[PDB]
Design an enzyme around this catalytic site. Sequence first.
Site, PDB file in Angstrom:
ATOM      1  N   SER A  82      -3.595  -1.613 -18.543  1.00  0.00           N
ATOM      2  CA  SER A  82      -4.466  -0.868 -17.304  1.00  0.00           C
ATOM      3  C   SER A  82      -3.614   0.192 -16.748  1.00  0.00           C
ATOM      4  CB  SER A  82      -4.693  -2.078 -16.408  1.00  0.00           C
ATOM      5  OG  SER A  82      -5.351  -3.051 -16.957  1.00  0.00           O
ATOM      6  N   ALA A 123      -2.390  -6.081 -21.883  1.00  0.00           N
ATOM      7  CA  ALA A 123      -2.579  -6.689 -20.506  1.00  0.00           C
ATOM      8  C   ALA A 123      -2.561  -5.690 -19.300  1.00  0.00           C
ATOM      9  CB  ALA A 123      -1.819  -7.879 -20.290  1.00  0.00           C
ATOM     10  N   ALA A 169       0.070  -3.543 -18.911  1.00  0.00           N
ATOM     11  CA  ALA A 169       0.539  -2.014 -19.429  1.00  0.00           C
ATOM     12  C   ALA A 169      -0.813  -1.432 -19.940  1.00  0.00           C
ATOM     13  CB  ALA A 169       1.380  -2.496 -20.773  1.00  0.00           C
ATOM     14  N   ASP A 171       5.607   3.162  -8.058  1.00  0.00           N
ATOM     15  CA  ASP A 171       5.225   1.816  -7.620  1.00  0.00           C
ATOM     16  C   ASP A 171       6.239   0.988  -8.202  1.00  0.00           C
ATOM     17  OD1 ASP A 171       2.838   3.343  -7.144  1.00  0.00           O
ATOM     18  OD2 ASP A 171       2.629   1.487  -5.945  1.00  0.00           O
ATOM     19  N   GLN A 222       4.211 -14.481 -12.428  1.00  0.00           N
ATOM     20  CA  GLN A 222       4.278 -15.929 -12.236  1.00  0.00           C
ATOM     21  C   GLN A 222       5.377 -16.333 -11.631  1.00  0.00           C
ATOM     22  OE1 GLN A 222       2.560 -17.612 -15.724  1.00  0.00           O
ATOM     23  NE2 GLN A 222       0.655 -17.040 -15.416  1.00  0.00           N
ATOM     24  N   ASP A 238      -6.092 -16.488 -21.950  1.00  0.00           N
ATOM     25  CA  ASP A 238      -4.927 -15.933 -22.269  1.00  0.00           C
ATOM     26  C   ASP A 238      -3.944 -16.185 -21.062  1.00  0.00           C
ATOM     27  OD1 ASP A 238      -6.010 -14.664 -24.554  1.00  0.00           O
ATOM     28  OD2 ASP A 238      -6.442 -12.937 -23.582  1.00  0.00           O
ATOM     29  N   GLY A 239      -4.587 -16.339 -19.803  1.00  0.00           N
ATOM     30  CA  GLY A 239      -3.389 -16.652 -18.790  1.00  0.00           C
ATOM     31  C   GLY A 239      -2.759 -17.862 -18.986  1.00  0.00           C
TER      32      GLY A 239
HETATM   33  N1  LIG Z   1       3.077   5.539  -6.320  1.00  0.00           N
HETATM   34  C1  LIG Z   1       2.631   6.632  -5.422  1.00  0.00           C
HETATM   35  O1  LIG Z   1       2.327   7.794  -5.804  1.00  0.00           O
HETATM   36  C2  LIG Z   1       2.438   6.008  -4.075  1.00  0.00           C
HETATM   37  C3  LIG Z   1       2.949   4.844  -3.626  1.00  0.00           C
HETATM   38  C4  LIG Z   1       2.764   4.427  -2.351  1.00  0.00           C
HETATM   39  C5  LIG Z   1       2.127   5.351  -1.432  1.00  0.00           C
HETATM   40  N2  LIG Z   1       1.969   6.777  -1.726  1.00  0.00           N
HETATM   41  C6  LIG Z   1       1.745   7.752  -0.926  1.00  0.00           C
HETATM   42  O2  LIG Z   1       2.446   7.730   0.256  1.00  0.00           O
HETATM   43  C7  LIG Z   1       1.827   8.133   1.507  1.00  0.00           C
HETATM   44  C8  LIG Z   1       2.606   7.751   2.665  1.00  0.00           C
HETATM   45  O3  LIG Z   1       4.000   8.177   2.561  1.00  0.00           O
HETATM   46  P1  LIG Z   1       5.063   7.964   3.416  1.00  0.00           P
HETATM   47  O4  LIG Z   1       5.846   8.843   4.249  1.00  0.00           O
HETATM   48  O5  LIG Z   1       4.809   6.603   4.275  1.00  0.00           O
HETATM   49  O6  LIG Z   1       6.349   7.435   2.327  1.00  0.00           O
HETATM   50  P2  LIG Z   1       6.166   6.853   0.661  1.00  0.00           P
HETATM   51  O7  LIG Z   1       4.692   5.796   0.507  1.00  0.00           O
HETATM   52  O8  LIG Z   1       7.292   6.628   0.188  1.00  0.00           O
HETATM   53  O9  LIG Z   1       5.552   8.268  -0.062  1.00  0.00           O
HETATM   54  C9  LIG Z   1       6.302   9.424   0.295  1.00  0.00           C
HETATM   55  C10 LIG Z   1       5.902  10.657  -0.628  1.00  0.00           C
HETATM   56  O10 LIG Z   1       4.554  10.748  -0.582  1.00  0.00           O
HETATM   57  C11 LIG Z   1       4.446  12.221  -0.557  1.00  0.00           C
HETATM   58  N3  LIG Z   1       3.196  12.511  -0.094  1.00  0.00           N
HETATM   59  C12 LIG Z   1       2.709  12.079   1.158  1.00  0.00           C
HETATM   60  N4  LIG Z   1       1.521  12.712   1.632  1.00  0.00           N
HETATM   61  C13 LIG Z   1       1.157  13.613   0.643  1.00  0.00           C
HETATM   62  C14 LIG Z   1       0.349  14.483   0.207  1.00  0.00           C
HETATM   63  N5  LIG Z   1      -1.018  14.614   1.134  1.00  0.00           N
HETATM   64  N6  LIG Z   1       0.095  15.244  -0.710  1.00  0.00           N
HETATM   65  C15 LIG Z   1       1.460  15.214  -1.656  1.00  0.00           C
HETATM   66  N7  LIG Z   1       2.269  14.251  -1.686  1.00  0.00           N
HETATM   67  C16 LIG Z   1       2.410  13.571  -0.434  1.00  0.00           C
HETATM   68  C17 LIG Z   1       5.680  12.670   0.176  1.00  0.00           C
HETATM   69  O11 LIG Z   1       5.776  14.011  -0.022  1.00  0.00           O
HETATM   70  P3  LIG Z   1       7.285  14.429   0.989  1.00  0.00           P
HETATM   71  O12 LIG Z   1       8.436  14.349  -0.066  1.00  0.00           O
HETATM   72  O13 LIG Z   1       7.181  15.974   1.257  1.00  0.00           O
HETATM   73  O14 LIG Z   1       7.053  13.686   2.130  1.00  0.00           O
HETATM   74  C18 LIG Z   1       6.800  11.929  -0.644  1.00  0.00           C
HETATM   75  O15 LIG Z   1       7.194  12.366  -1.992  1.00  0.00           O
HETATM   76  C19 LIG Z   1       0.456   7.319   1.446  1.00  0.00           C
HETATM   77  O16 LIG Z   1      -0.490   7.927   2.084  1.00  0.00           O
HETATM   78  C20 LIG Z   1       0.293   7.473   0.047  1.00  0.00           C
HETATM   79  O17 LIG Z   1      -0.593   8.355  -0.446  1.00  0.00           O
HETATM   80  C21 LIG Z   1       2.178   7.087  -3.147  1.00  0.00           C
HETATM   81  N1  LIG Z   2      -4.349  -4.552 -12.801  1.00  0.00           N
HETATM   82  C1  LIG Z   2      -4.063  -5.185 -13.965  1.00  0.00           C
HETATM   83  O1  LIG Z   2      -4.465  -5.119 -15.119  1.00  0.00           O
HETATM   84  C2  LIG Z   2      -3.003  -6.456 -13.657  1.00  0.00           C
HETATM   85  C3  LIG Z   2      -2.224  -6.906 -12.527  1.00  0.00           C
HETATM   86  C4  LIG Z   2      -1.627  -8.186 -12.412  1.00  0.00           C
HETATM   87  C5  LIG Z   2      -1.541  -8.478 -13.618  1.00  0.00           C
HETATM   88  N2  LIG Z   2      -1.971  -8.423 -14.855  1.00  0.00           N
HETATM   89  C6  LIG Z   2      -1.663  -9.062 -15.945  1.00  0.00           C
HETATM   90  O2  LIG Z   2      -1.894 -10.457 -15.630  1.00  0.00           O
HETATM   91  C7  LIG Z   2      -0.896 -11.448 -16.366  1.00  0.00           C
HETATM   92  C8  LIG Z   2      -0.847 -12.649 -15.743  1.00  0.00           C
HETATM   93  O3  LIG Z   2      -2.244 -13.132 -15.813  1.00  0.00           O
HETATM   94  P1  LIG Z   2      -2.585 -14.591 -14.840  1.00  0.00           P
HETATM   95  O4  LIG Z   2      -3.329 -15.594 -15.565  1.00  0.00           O
HETATM   96  O5  LIG Z   2      -1.362 -14.721 -13.983  1.00  0.00           O
HETATM   97  O6  LIG Z   2      -3.566 -13.968 -13.872  1.00  0.00           O
HETATM   98  P2  LIG Z   2      -3.936 -12.387 -13.513  1.00  0.00           P
HETATM   99  O7  LIG Z   2      -2.701 -11.834 -12.845  1.00  0.00           O
HETATM  100  O8  LIG Z   2      -4.878 -12.599 -12.265  1.00  0.00           O
HETATM  101  O9  LIG Z   2      -4.620 -11.763 -14.633  1.00  0.00           O
HETATM  102  C9  LIG Z   2      -5.478 -12.469 -15.476  1.00  0.00           C
HETATM  103  C10 LIG Z   2      -6.100 -11.500 -16.327  1.00  0.00           C
HETATM  104  O10 LIG Z   2      -5.123 -10.884 -17.293  1.00  0.00           O
HETATM  105  C11 LIG Z   2      -5.859 -11.176 -18.551  1.00  0.00           C
HETATM  106  N3  LIG Z   2      -4.759 -11.118 -19.456  1.00  0.00           N
HETATM  107  C12 LIG Z   2      -3.666 -12.122 -19.476  1.00  0.00           C
HETATM  108  N4  LIG Z   2      -2.645 -11.807 -20.458  1.00  0.00           N
HETATM  109  C13 LIG Z   2      -3.322 -10.873 -21.447  1.00  0.00           C
HETATM  110  C14 LIG Z   2      -2.937 -10.446 -22.698  1.00  0.00           C
HETATM  111  N5  LIG Z   2      -1.933 -10.499 -23.321  1.00  0.00           N
HETATM  112  N6  LIG Z   2      -3.896  -9.528 -23.236  1.00  0.00           N
HETATM  113  C15 LIG Z   2      -5.185  -9.078 -22.358  1.00  0.00           C
HETATM  114  N7  LIG Z   2      -5.594  -9.633 -21.396  1.00  0.00           N
HETATM  115  C16 LIG Z   2      -4.525 -10.610 -20.742  1.00  0.00           C
HETATM  116  C17 LIG Z   2      -6.513 -12.531 -18.662  1.00  0.00           C
HETATM  117  O11 LIG Z   2      -7.368 -12.534 -19.700  1.00  0.00           O
HETATM  118  P3  LIG Z   2      -8.362 -13.954 -19.709  1.00  0.00           P
HETATM  119  O12 LIG Z   2      -9.448 -13.877 -18.772  1.00  0.00           O
HETATM  120  O13 LIG Z   2      -8.687 -14.314 -20.909  1.00  0.00           O
HETATM  121  O14 LIG Z   2      -7.330 -14.892 -19.053  1.00  0.00           O
HETATM  122  C18 LIG Z   2      -7.329 -12.246 -17.121  1.00  0.00           C
HETATM  123  O15 LIG Z   2      -8.447 -11.249 -17.598  1.00  0.00           O
HETATM  124  C19 LIG Z   2       0.458 -10.357 -16.202  1.00  0.00           C
HETATM  125  O16 LIG Z   2       1.166 -10.871 -17.061  1.00  0.00           O
HETATM  126  C20 LIG Z   2       0.039  -9.009 -16.176  1.00  0.00           C
HETATM  127  O17 LIG Z   2       0.204  -8.605 -17.623  1.00  0.00           O
HETATM  128  C21 LIG Z   2      -2.822  -7.283 -14.784  1.00  0.00           C
END
Ligand SMILES: NC(=O)c1ccc[n+]([C@@H]2O[C@H](COP(=O)([O-])OP(=O)(O)OC[C@H]3O[C@@H](n4cnc5c(N)ncnc54)[C@H](OP(=O)(O)O)[C@@H]3O)[C@@H](O)[C@H]2O)c1
Ligand SMILES: NC(=O)c1ccc[n+]([C@@H]2O[C@H](COP(=O)([O-])OP(=O)(O)OC[C@H]3O[C@@H](n4cnc5c(N)ncnc54)[C@H](OP(=O)(O)O)[C@@H]3O)[C@@H](O)[C@H]2O)c1
Lengths: 290, 290, 290, 290
Positions: free
Chosen positions: C191, C187, C189, C175, C246, C71-72
Site C-alpha cells: 500500500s 501488506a 509495504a 511519516d 500488534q 492473514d492477520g
Molecule cells: N509525510 C508528510 O509529508 C507529512 C506528514 C505530516 C504533515 N505534513 C504536512 O505538514 C503540515 C503542517 O506542517 P507543520 O509546520 O505543522 O510541521 P510538520 O508536520 O513537521 O511539516 C513541516 C514541513 O511541511 C512543509 N510544508 C508545510 N506546508 C507546506 C506547503 N503548503 N507546501 C509545501 N510544503 C509545506 C514545511 O515546509 P517548511 O520547511 O518551509 O516549513 C516543512 O517541510 C500539514 O498541514 C501537512 O500538510 C506532511
Molecule cells: N494502510 C495499510 O495498508 C496498512 C496499515 C496498517 C497495517 N497494515 C498491515 O496490517 C498488518 C496487521 O494486520 P492486522 O490483522 O493486525 O489488522 P490491520 O492492521 O487492520 O490489517 C488487516 C489487513 O491486512 C491484511 N494483511 C495482513 N497481512 C497480509 C499479508 N501478508 N499480505 C496481504 N495482506 C495482508 C489482512 O488480510 P486479511 O483480510 O486476509 O486478514 C487485512 O486485509 C501489519 O503487519 C501491516 O502490514 C496495513
Amino acid sequence: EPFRNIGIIGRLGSTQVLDTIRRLKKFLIDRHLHVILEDTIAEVLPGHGLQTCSRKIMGEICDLVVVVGGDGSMLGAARALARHKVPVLGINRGSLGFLTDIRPDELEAKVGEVLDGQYIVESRFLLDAQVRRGIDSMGQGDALNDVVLHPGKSTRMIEFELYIDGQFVCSQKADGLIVATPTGSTAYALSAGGPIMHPKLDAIVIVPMYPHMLSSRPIVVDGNSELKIVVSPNMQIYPQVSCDGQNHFTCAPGDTVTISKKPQKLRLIHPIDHNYYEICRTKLGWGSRL
Amino acid sequence: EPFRNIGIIGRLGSTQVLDTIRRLKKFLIDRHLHVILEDTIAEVLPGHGLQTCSRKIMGEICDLVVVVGGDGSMLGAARALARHKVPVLGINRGSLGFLTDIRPDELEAKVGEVLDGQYIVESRFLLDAQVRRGIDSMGQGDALNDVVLHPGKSTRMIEFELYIDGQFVCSQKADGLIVATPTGSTAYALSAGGPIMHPKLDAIVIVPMYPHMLSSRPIVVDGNSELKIVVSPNMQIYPQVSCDGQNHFTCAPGDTVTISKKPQKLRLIHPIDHNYYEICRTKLGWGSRL
Amino acid sequence: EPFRNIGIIGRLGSTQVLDTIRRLKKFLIDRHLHVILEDTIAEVLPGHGLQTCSRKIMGEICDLVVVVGGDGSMLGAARALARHKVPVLGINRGSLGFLTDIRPDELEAKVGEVLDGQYIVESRFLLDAQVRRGIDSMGQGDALNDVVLHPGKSTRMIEFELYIDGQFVCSQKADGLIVATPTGSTAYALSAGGPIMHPKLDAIVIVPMYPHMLSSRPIVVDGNSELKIVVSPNMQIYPQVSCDGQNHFTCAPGDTVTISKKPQKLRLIHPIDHNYYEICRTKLGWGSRL
Amino acid sequence: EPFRNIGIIGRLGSTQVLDTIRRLKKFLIDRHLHVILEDTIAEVLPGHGLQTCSRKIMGEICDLVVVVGGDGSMLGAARALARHKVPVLGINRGSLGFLTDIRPDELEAKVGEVLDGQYIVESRFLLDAQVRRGIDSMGQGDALNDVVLHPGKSTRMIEFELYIDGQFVCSQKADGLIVATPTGSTAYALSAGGPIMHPKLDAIVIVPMYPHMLSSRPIVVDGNSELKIVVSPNMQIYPQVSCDGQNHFTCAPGDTVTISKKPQKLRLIHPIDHNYYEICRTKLGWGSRL
Ligand SMILES: NC(=O)c1ccc[n+]([C@@H]2O[C@H](COP(=O)([O-])OP(=O)(O)OC[C@H]3O[C@@H](n4cnc5c(N)ncnc54)[C@H](OP(=O)(O)O)[C@@H]3O)[C@@H](O)[C@H]2O)c1
Ligand SMILES: NC(=O)c1ccc[n+]([C@@H]2O[C@H](COP(=O)([O-])OP(=O)(O)OC[C@H]3O[C@@H](n4cnc5c(N)ncnc54)[C@H](OP(=O)(O)O)[C@@H]3O)[C@@H](O)[C@H]2O)c1
Ligand SMILES: NC(=O)c1ccc[n+]([C@@H]2O[C@H](COP(=O)([O-])OP(=O)(O)OC[C@H]3O[C@@H](n4cnc5c(N)ncnc54)[C@H](OP(=O)(O)O)[C@@H]3O)[C@@H](O)[C@H]2O)c1
Ligand SMILES: NC(=O)c1ccc[n+]([C@@H]2O[C@H](COP(=O)([O-])OP(=O)(O)OC[C@H]3O[C@@H](n4cnc5c(N)ncnc54)[C@H](OP(=O)(O)O)[C@@H]3O)[C@@H](O)[C@H]2O)c1
C-alpha cells in the site's frame, strides 16, 4: 489602504528567526511605523520591544502582518488572520517556500518595495471542517493546507465512506484521507501521491492515505463541493481529524466530518518578483532553462 | 429540438457490436425515425440498410448520433461531431464506461426514455493541439481524451520545455508528456500516475511519462491555460504527438506544440439514471456501500 | 512426523470463524486425534471442548496447529510457533489469502489430504527487532510481516538515519519506514508503493512512509543484511515501532532500532494444490488466462 | 593478473570525453603500457594514436578496458566484454554514476591506485533474451540494464502473458514490461515505479509499463528464474523488444520472449573508495548525515 500598524508573527525556532525578527523591527521602526508584537513570541525578545497583543486581536489592530519563518509558520497565522482579512507577508529562512517569499538578506529591499506601493495581492481559500455526532457538533476547525483523517491511537486501518455534494462516492479501508487546497497540494498530499494544483485553480484534491485497495487514486473536484466523511459505525476504530496537522479531534464510530470551502480568503502579499513555477523548480529540483 | 434524423456510429469489432447496431436500427425505425448510417461502417452491414453518409457530413444531417461500442469509439465521433454540436449518445458493450452509458440489454428502455424527453445534457470540452515550425504550421488536431508527446522511432528519452500562459515551468527529460481533459483523466493519465478529475471541473492535468527526474509530479492547471511544449533543439530526437492516440504528427528538434481548450464542446446525452461515481466504482472496483 | 496432537488457533471475530472451528473439531476428533484448544479462544466455545493450553505452551504439545481466519490471524500464531518450529496450516474465510489456503467448504477435503500425507512444507523467515538506549535494551519483538516505524502521538514527520550492515544509507524526514519480509511485501509495504517479493526470495524491502523527499524510493537488500534505524537526537519526536502492527514500543530521540532476520523459520504447510500466483490473481484482480 | 595491454572505449559525445580520453592515453603510456583503441572511436582522434581493434576483438587483446563517459557508455562495453570476462573500469563526466566511478579530475589518482594493486572486483550479471516463433529463433540479445517490451509503431496498448519458471502469472494490457537486473533497477525501472535493488542481490524485478490495471505492481523474483513473455496471438499489435534500449527486435502476435540470467558476469573494477549508497545520495539527492 497604506500599511501603518504592522504586526509580526514568528516561530520559537532556531536563532536566525530571532535575528530577522529584529532586522524587521529595525527596518520598520526606521520608517516611523508602529510595530505590534505577538504575545506568544514577545515573552522571549530583546527587551520585549513595543506593544504586545494576541493573534485574534492582531486582526483589527494591524493593517499588515509579516510572518517570519517557513511555510509551517504561515499556516497558523492564516487561520486567525483570514477571518479579519488582514494582508499577510511571509519571510523565508533562506530557502524559497510556497507561502514565504522574502529571503532574510533581501528583507529591506523587498519589504520596502511592498511598503512603497509595488506588490501583488493573491487570495487563497481555506477549508472548513466540522465534526458532528448525529446532530450535536463536536468541534469546528479551519485549514489552509489540509484536513487529514488518520488513525487515532491504533495502527489498524480505518474505514469510512466519502460523500461529495450528498452523492455517494465509495467506501474505503486505508490509513486515512487527505483533503487539500491548492495551497496544501504541495504538502502532505504531494507526499501521498497527489498532484500539484496551481493556486489559480478553484478545486479540492482528495488523496487516500496508503489504501488497502490499489486502485484508490486521488480525485480532484470542484472547489465549491461539500465533502462528507462518515466514519465506519461497525468498527471499533476511533480516528483523528487534523487541520494543518495542528488542531486535532477524536472521532467516534459513526461520526460525520463535513469539509467545504471557507468564505473568508487569506490575503497573501507578494512582491512583483514573485513566480510560482520558480518556487517549484527550487523546492522540487525541476530542471531550469535548457 | 426533438430528435428525428438519428445517425449511428460503430466500430468494426466483435460480433456483438454488429448485433446491437441492428437492434438500434430496429427500435428506431420502429418509432418511424430516419436512420442514417456511417459510410465507413455501412460497407459491411445487413443489406447496407438505409441512406449512407460520412462523419463530417453526419453533423448537419442528424439531430442525434448514437455511438455503439466503448469509450474508444466515443473519441473518434466526438472530434467530428463537436464542431457541429450534435448530441451524442453512447452504448456499452455490457460494461459501464466513462463515456458510454447504455447497456445493450437496456437499449430499448434507456434509448426510448431519452427520446420520450427524459435525459441530461452534459458538455465536455476538447483540447486544441497545433504544431509549428517557427511560424509555419505543420498540423492541427483535436482531442477529447489527451494530447500525448511520446518518443518517435527511438526508445531514447526525449527532452522538452513546458510553458503555461507564456510562463516557463521547467525543462524535463522523460518518455514524454500527457495533457488530459477531465474526460481523459481516467485514461492514459490515470495509468501514468495522474489523478481523477471530476467532469464538472474546468481544469487540465499535465502528467510526465516516466520522468528521469523522480520529483516530476502531475500538475493541474486552469482549463483556460495555454500550454506550449518546445522540443529540445539541441537533441537529435524526433518525438511524436498523438491526439487520442489516433492522429499522429512527427515533431522536429525545436518544434513547438501549443495546447489549449477548444471552443466547441461535445454535447453528451445521458439518461437521468446516470451517476459518475458509480462508473468509477465499477471501472476501478471501489468499495460499495458499507 | 505424523500429526497426532493437533492444536487450533482462532480469532474472536464474525460467527463463521466459530462455525468452522467446530467443523474442524468434528473432522479431527472423527479421525481419533487429540484436539488441544487455545485458552484465549476456549473461554467462549461450545462447552469449551477438550483440553486447554496457552500459545507459548502449544508449541511443545502439538505436532500441527490449524489457524482459522485470515492473514492477520496467521501473524500472531507465527511469532509464537516459529520458536518451537511447529507446522502451521491456515484456513480462509472464503477468500484466498497469502497465508491462509483452505476454504471453509473444502475443509474436510484439503485438511484430510494433508493428514493423509500429501502436503508441501514451505518455510518463511521472520524479522528480529530490538530497541536500544545507548547500551540498555528496551524491548525485542518478532515480526512475520513488517517492522514499522511511525509517528507516536504526534502527526508531525519523524526524522531518522538508516544503516545497512553498518554502512550509512541516508537521513530522511517522513511519516516513517516499513521494513518487510517477502511475506509482508504484499501488506502495508504494498500500500505504500513497495514491490511484491516472491516467497522464494531471500531479501528484505525498505519502504519509506510518505517521504518529504519525492526521490525516496523503496530499496530491496540481501535478506541477511542488518538494519539499524537511528531516531533523530536533535528532534522532540517520540516515534513508535510496530511489529505486525500488534506489538508497540515508544522510541526516544536517539534510540536505535536494529532489524535482522530471525534464525527460526515458520514451517508453513500447504496442499499440493497451492499456487502463489493464483493468490495474487485473486487478491489483486490480475487478469487470468488469455 | 597485472594489467599490461589496456583498452579504451569512449562515446562520440561532448568535447570533454575527447579530452579525458587523451589524459588517460598520456597517463597510461607514461607508465609504459600498451594502449589499444576502439576502432569506432579511433576514426576521430589526435593522429589516431596507437593500434586499433574492434570491440569483440578487444576481449582477448586487453587485460583491462577503461570506459570513459557515463552509465550509458558502460552498457555497450559490458555486453561485448562480459563474454571474454575482461575487467572494466569506468570514468565519470564529473558526476557520480551507478556504473562509472572515476571523476575526470581524479583520473591519475584513482586509475594509478588501481594499477598499483588497490582495487575491488565486483561482478554484475546480465540478462539473456531470445525471441522465438514457435520453434524458430528470431534473435538473441544480452542486456546489463533491462530487457524492455514496448509498443512497436503503434501507440495502442499491447497485450501479453507472463510466465515465471513455466508457471502462469497473469495476462496484462499495458504499454509494456520492464525486466531489470540490480544494475538496471535504477534506470528505466526506477522511472516506472520499480524499487532500488542492491547489487549484492541475486534477483530480477519485473515492472509493468503504465498498466491499464491499477493493481499491476512490480514483482521481485529469484535471479535464477526463467521468464517467458507470450505476445497476445489474438491482437494485431507488433511489439518491440529492447535490450538496454539499443538492440531492437520486432515481435509478431504469438511470439515468445524468454529472459534469464546470463552465465558470464561482467567484471567491474572499483577503487577501494567506492560506496554504493553514496552514489544513491548524489544521483537521487538523498539527505546526508544528520
Ligand atoms: N509525510 C508528510 O509529508 C507529512 C506528514 C505530516 C504533515 N505534513 C504536512 O505538514 C503540515 C503542517 O506542517 P507543520 O509546520 O505543522 O510541521 P510538520 O508536520 O513537521 O511539516 C513541516 C514541513 O511541511 C512543509 N510544508 C508545510 N506546508 C507546506 C506547503 N503548503 N507546501 C509545501 N510544503 C509545506 C514545511 O515546509 P517548511 O520547511 O518551509 O516549513 C516543512 O517541510 C500539514 O498541514 C501537512 O500538510 C506532511
Ligand atoms: N494502510 C495499510 O495498508 C496498512 C496499515 C496498517 C497495517 N497494515 C498491515 O496490517 C498488518 C496487521 O494486520 P492486522 O490483522 O493486525 O489488522 P490491520 O492492521 O487492520 O490489517 C488487516 C489487513 O491486512 C491484511 N494483511 C495482513 N497481512 C497480509 C499479508 N501478508 N499480505 C496481504 N495482506 C495482508 C489482512 O488480510 P486479511 O483480510 O486476509 O486478514 C487485512 O486485509 C501489519 O503487519 C501491516 O502490514 C496495513
Ligand atoms: N497504457 C495506457 O494506459 C494507454 C496507452 C495508450 C493509450 N491509452 C489511452 O487510449 C486512448 C485511445 O484508446 P483507443 O480506443 O485508441 O485504444 P487503446 O489506445 O488501445 O486504448 C483503449 C483502452 O482505453 C480505454 N479508454 C479510452 N478512453 C478512456 C477514458 N476516457 N477513460 C477510461 N478509459 C478510457 C478503453 O476503454 P474501453 O475498453 O471502454 O474502450 C480501452 O480500455 C488514448 O486517448 C489514451 O488515453 C492508454
Ligand atoms: N524514461 C526513462 O527513464 C527511460 C526511457 C528509456 C530508456 N531508459 C534507460 O536508458 C537505458 C539506455 O541508456 P542510453 O545510454 O541508451 O540512453 P537513454 O535511453 O537516453 O538513457 C540515458 C540515461 O539513462 C541513464 N542510465 C543508464 N543506465 C543507468 C543505470 N543503470 N542506472 C541509472 N541511470 C542509468 C543515463 O545515466 P548517464 O547520464 O550517467 O549516462 C542517462 O541519464 C536503458 O537500458 C533504460 O534503462 C530510461
